DNA sequence: GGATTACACCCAAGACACCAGGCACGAGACAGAAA
């Protein structure tokens, strides 16, 4: 429902991964995961740069 | 306005001066013409 902020409702996974994740935690924690892939993939490229110069 | 934004490796696939038009050499066929 709209303006819920229960810790259900806005990303909290409450089970534990022997016991399953529901649909909405699934969901929610694909999403974290898709955000730390991001991550790595692109601050690889800032700290090459970062080595380049310093090395230079 | 300018300059630069990780390293290495693999494979596959599609494109890369085309062309057209005016100038030359050789040849040959079907029609001329004397007999």
Redesign the pocket.
């Known amino acids: 429902t709209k303006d819920d902020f229960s810790p259900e409702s806005k990303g909290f996974v409450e089970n534990s991964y022997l016991r399953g994740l529901t649909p909405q935690e699934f969901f929610f924690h694909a999403m974290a995961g898709r955000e730390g892939l991001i991550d790595t993939?692109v601050k690889?490229?800032e700290?090459?740069?970062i080595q380049?110069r310093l090395v230079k």
């Open positions: 993939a690889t490229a700290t090459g740069y380049r």
